[PDB]
Structure 1
Amino acid sequence: LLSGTGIRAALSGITMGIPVIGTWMHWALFGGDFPGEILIPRLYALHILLIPGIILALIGAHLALVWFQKHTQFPGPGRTETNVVGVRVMPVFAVKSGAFFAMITGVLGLMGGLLTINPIWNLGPYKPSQVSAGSQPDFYMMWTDGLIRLWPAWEFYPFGHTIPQGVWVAVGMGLVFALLIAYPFIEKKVTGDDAHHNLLQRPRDVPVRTAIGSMAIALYLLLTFACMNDIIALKFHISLNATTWIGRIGMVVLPAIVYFVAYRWAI
């Protein structure tokens, strides 16, 4: 019920609202209307083989790049741009990395035991007519959901057509991902630094970038809590409209406040 409601919201509505090809993408993905009989098999393929395969390939590329483009290091006594000060792989690094893996999997197992996650038995089977009040995605998609909630219902109606509010959030996600992917090139174009940098710089030493990162984290947290405004309103007694409009105003006020505060804090 919960996850199918999330699918109905995001995958169906956002996809089908896209102006030129929205319905076409929706029908291609779902094999027809929303409850098409191939959605879950397609997602199963994508989720067990296709996307995890790409993730594995990209993690291999990532680790190979880190390995052969020797890991950068913070400035220190003997640390320069042309050396790596640390510990060798065999005696110390390997053992501590293996131990850290053991401890991380121990934390994950302890949480799997002691903390209940996704009680699907409580969450009845998906039915279009049924829904709950929570209706949230996992915390990583919570910012997209919060963007959906907060964006102020602006719809455009060209000649005999509709441009629903879903396109706004779709374009917002596109911009978020484009900016995240292209930041290093944006930063180099802005500042002008193309020098081969092997020594990290403390976040305080770069006030503008730490300020921008703090601003972005503030916006992300604002969106994430906007997605949770329902439960926030329920438990912390704040009217739901008040939470929605707090998010709406903050997503332009809170990023600026956090930017200024982080810049001055770094300096």
Structure 2
Amino acid sequence: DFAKLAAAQGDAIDSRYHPSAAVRRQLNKVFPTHWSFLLGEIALYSFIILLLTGVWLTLFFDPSMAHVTYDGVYQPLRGVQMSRAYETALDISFEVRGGLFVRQVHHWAALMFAASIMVHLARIFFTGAFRRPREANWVIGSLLLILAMFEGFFGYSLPDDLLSGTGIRAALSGITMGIPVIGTWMHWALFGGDFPGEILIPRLYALHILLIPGIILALIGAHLALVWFQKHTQFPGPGRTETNVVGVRVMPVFAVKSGAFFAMITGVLGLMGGLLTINPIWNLGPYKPSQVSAGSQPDFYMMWTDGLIRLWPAWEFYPFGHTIPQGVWVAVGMGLVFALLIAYPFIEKKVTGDDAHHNLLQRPRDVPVRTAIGSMAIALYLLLTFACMNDIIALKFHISLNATTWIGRIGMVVLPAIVYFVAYRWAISLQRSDREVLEHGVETGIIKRLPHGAYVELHQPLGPVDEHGHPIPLEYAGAPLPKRMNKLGSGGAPGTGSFLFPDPAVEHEALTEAAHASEHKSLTALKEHQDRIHG
């Protein structure tokens, strides 16, 4: 009697505790059903998969520089001195059932985590979800992004590899020693000595499996709690206002679709871990200061920092008996990048004057200057990433390596400007298109007038039509406009039988008019609620 068991368990729960009101509030919480609001969930799900795979990895990983000869199964690396970290990474890859798959899905989850964090940041920035109520949310999310970047750095640096080791040597060691007053001291504190200090990988292992994941988990908890209680913002729409949330309740629909989305994200990541090879360390010999490779790139989320290193033009200053190497330039650049990213909402409000409580998102077209600035920043980030990749770009796409370096150097001040101008004008022209639709109706096929030979596109008005043909223009309300009669009530009733065979006409008619009734009922309910809010 599962129904009786459920009832008895509910009564016992509500007697021991009293979660009825709280649970009802959680279940009844309404979440907007916009697709772009799942971008953060992608990052959350990738993070969960990262935790689950990282536990498995830590069950088999040994962090240490203790030198050992492999003497494993992988023949191409036998008798070669390597760190125990590399040896156990190879053991995970080869000598544990499914360890290669687990580590590959872990790395793919890391890449998807960074990518989805970037996409979510783009969504919120361009939609203006950081304004008065949620600047703190933006700030903690920026800290979260920085932590994710650096944890991925430490994660692919954990198995001491040739690629990851040379990346560490460059970024960490060089840029740390570069810092003027405390650079060498920071280097010695972090590595416990010179660069190959025998505590580096244990320290990174701790930072990567316990410390940084703990901070990220706490910050994700704060992030999700803030989103939960500062009810999720929404785009302007029929019944959507600054003081309501139009969407679906948590329990019946949102919970089911979020769980299913998590399942599908897990499936995508597992499929990638299977079919796509990620970081094949066995091809990469154990780290040695002398051995190198041509590629020498970090993961894509640090590729922009590496590209900054490459592109910045070798400007070194030599104060009285001292040196200020080119690494400090990039250190300051990264500092500026993070500072501006964290402080943008406050910069935005200082610049514009907006101190209003904003609960309705802005369309990126509707906010041109911010959209232009975001496009400019994305262009700069892409230029830096492809500059880091300039080695492989030059190799495959036959471009001189010097040519790619200087393309990056010039474009990091030219391409941002071009993209800013283009994005600003593009946003304004999207606004112009929206107003054209508002004032003339949707466009359709052309018709030749009866008496004379005029051609008229035979538009379709979206609002009340004047006594004559031309309609009364509507007022823009911040919501997207249907520019195709495709997406309106036109040409949308295929035979509802099946792909290969029809259904009885009575069934088809019943279904089609039932759907018509349901959709017009939804439209009428939204219209009535909209009229009720002010009217």
TM-score range, shorter chain: over 0.9
- Structure 1 stretches of 4+ with a deviation exceeding 6 A read none
Measured after TM superposition, the shift of residue 60 of structure 1 is 0.0
**CA deviation map 1:129-169 (0-9, x unaligned):** 00000000000000000000000000000000000000000
Report the CA distance between 1:30 and its aligned residue: 0.1
**Which whole-Å CA distance do the structure 1 matches of 2:169 and 2:362 have between them?**
44
Q: Spell out, residue by residue over 1:96-130, the C-alpha distance to the aligned partner (whole angstroms, 9 max, x if none).
A: 00000000000000000000000000010000000
Higher RCO (CA-CA < 8 Å; seq separation 6+): 1
Matched with 2:503 is: none
- CA deviation digits over 1:79-98, x for unaligned, max 9? 00000000000000000000
* Residue 384 (structure 2) aligns with: 223
| C-alpha deviation, 1:209, in angstroms | 0.1
By how many angstroms is 1:69 displaced?
0.1
Distance 2:285 2:340 in 1: 39
The 5 Å alignment of 1:63-82 reads 63-82=224-243
**SS of residue in 2 equivalent to 1:204:** coil
Aligned match of 1:184: 345
Q: Structure 1: how far apart are the matches of 2:301 and 2:404?
A: 20
Shift of 1:198: 0.1
C-alpha deviations, 1:3-27, integer Å up to 9, x for none? Answer: 0000000000000000000000000
Shift of 1:66: 0.1
Equivalent residue number for residue 311 of structure 2: 150
Distance 2:395 2:198 in 1: 36
1:80 alignment partner, SS class? coil
Alignment counterpart, residue 197 of structure 1, candidates 353, 358, 365: 358
1: CA distance between counterparts of 2:178 and 2:368?
40
Q: Deviation digits for residues 45-86 of structure 1, max 9, x if unmatched?
A: 000000000000000000000000000000000000000000
Q: 1:140 is paired with a residue of what secondary structure?
A: helix
Alpha-carbon separation, structure 2, partners of 1:17 and 1:170: 9
In structure 1, stretches of 5+ residues that fail to align are: none
Quote the offset at 1:206 in angstroms.
Answer: 0.3
* Distance in 1 (alpha carbons) for counterparts of 2:359 and 2:178: 46
Once the two structures are TM-superposed, the CA of residue 171 in structure 1 deviates from its matched residue by 0.1
Alignment of 1:16 onto 2:177? yes
- The aligned counterpart of 2:249 is 88
CA RMSD of the aligned region, Å?
A: 0.1
Q: CA deviation at 1:189?
A: 0.2
The CA deviation at 1:225 is 0.1
Q: Distance in 1 between matches of 2:381 and 2:397?
A: 21
Question: Are 1:105 and 2:266 counterparts?
Answer: yes
**Structure ID, larger Rg:** 2
Give 1:238 deviation, angstroms. Answer: 0.1
Q: Deviation of residue 35 (structure 1)?
A: 0.1
CA-to-aligned-CA distance 1:184-229 (integer Å, 9 cap, x gap) = 0000000000100000000000000000000000000000000000
Identity %: 100
Aligned-residue offset at 1:251: 0.1
Q: When the two structures are aligned, how many residues end up with a matched partner? A: 265
SS of the equivalent of 1:84 reads strand
Deviation at 1:235, TM superposition (A): 0.1
TM-score by length of 2: 0.50
Identify unmatched segments of 5+ residues in structure 2: 1-161, 427-535
Q: Matched residues in 1 for 2:299 and 2:247: separation?
A: 37
Q: Secondary structure at the match of 2:377?
A: helix
SS in structure 2 of the partner of residue 183 of structure 1: helix
Where 1:264 maps in the other structure, the secondary structure is helix
Aligned-pair distance for 1:33? 0.1
CA distance in 2, matches of 1:7, 1:198: 43
Give the Cα separation in 2 of the matches to 1:254 and 1:17.
29
Hey, what's the Cα distance between the residues in 1 that align with 2:232 and 2:239? 15
CA distance in 2, matches of 1:10, 1:188: 35
